[PDB]
Amino acid sequence: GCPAEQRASPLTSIISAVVGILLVVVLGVVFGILIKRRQQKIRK
Amino acid sequence: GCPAEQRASPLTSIISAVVGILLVVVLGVVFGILIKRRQQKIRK
Helix, strand or coil: CCCCCCCCCCHHHHHHHHHHHHHHHHHHHHHHHHHHHHHHCCCC | CCCCCCCCCCCHHHHHHHHHHHHHHHHHHHHHHHHHCCCCCCCC
C-alpha cells in the first residue's frame, strides 16, 4: 500500500525489469540445455 | 563469410552488451553462492 517508492530516474525501472527477466532466462535456458544434455538424473 | 551484417539502431549494440555481461554474472554469481553453499566437490 505504498506505491511510488522510487527516487531514481524513470529508466531505473526498466533496468531492474530486464535484469530480473534475463537472469531467469539465463539459468532457465543454460540449465535447460545443459541438463537436457547430460540427462543423468531421475526424469520426472 | 561476412558475419555481423546488421544495420540496426545504435541501441541494439548496448542491448547485446548488457545481455552478455548479465548472463555471465548470472551464472557466475548464482553458481558462486549455490556451489559455495553445498561444497560437495573435491574435498581437501
